[PDB]
């Protein structure tokens, strides 16, 4: 793995403090930290977790299994930005997740949005940019839960997915990063946590 900077302690700080079991406290802004930097650091880690979580069930999610992006039959997702695609496009769950993951990555590699220099302020619209990222990442949990959960449990990956989702939901709730409207696919699960 990666071996051995402020955002990086912030990350290892966030990961380690989760081990107290009390996720509501662990997700809170540490004393005197930049709110944007805290959100940015956790947003990246969430992208990485959800990227590897989906990567474990990748072989069961196919154009044949999932002809549309679904969180149950009550919710379907079509891809748009818009920059390259401004009108939402019906596509498969693997293709859609590709577009979403490539797009999240593209924003993470954008130094105007996520400055890698430690003294450069985050943009004024950063808060809006991060809310859009996390809102779409949630739909990757949503599709895995509603469709590929048998595969998640066939692999030993249930606790991984559950702990990461709990962490994700508590973080999103603490900072007001996602509306009820968007969390409705996982409603019953979010109430139980």
């Amino acid at each position: 793995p990666k071996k051995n900077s402020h955002q990086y302690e912030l990350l290892k700080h966030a990961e380690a403090t989760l081990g107290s079991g009390n996720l509501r406290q662990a997700v809170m802004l540490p004393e005197g930290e930049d709110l944007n930097e805290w959100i940015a650091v956790n947003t990246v880690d969430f992208f990485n977790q959800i990227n590897m979580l989906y990567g474990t069930i990748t072989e069961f999610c196919t154009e044949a299994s999932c002809p549309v992006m679904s969180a149950g039959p009550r919710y379907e997702y079509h891809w748009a930005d818009g920059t390259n695609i401004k009108k939402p496009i019906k596509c498969s769950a693997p293709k859609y997740i590709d577009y979403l993951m490539t797009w999240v990555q593209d924003q993470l590699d954008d130094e105007t949005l996520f400055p890698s220099k430690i003294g450069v302020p985050f943009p004024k619209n950063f808060m809006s940019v991060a809310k859009t990222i996390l809102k779409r990442l949630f739909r990757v949990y949503a599709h895995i839960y509603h469709q590929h959960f048998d595969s998640v449990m066939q692999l030993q990956e249930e606790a991984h997915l559950n702990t990461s989702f709990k962490h994700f939901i508590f973080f999103v709730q603490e900072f007001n990063l996602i509306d009820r409207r968007e969390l409705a696919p996982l409603q019953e699960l979010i109430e139980k946590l």
């Binding site: 039959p73 009550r74 919710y75 379907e76 997702y77 079509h78 748009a80 939402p88």
Partner: peptide, 5 residues
């Protein structure tokens, strides 16, 4: 973006 049934 997000469609219902």
């Amino acid at each position: 973006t997000m469609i219902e049934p």
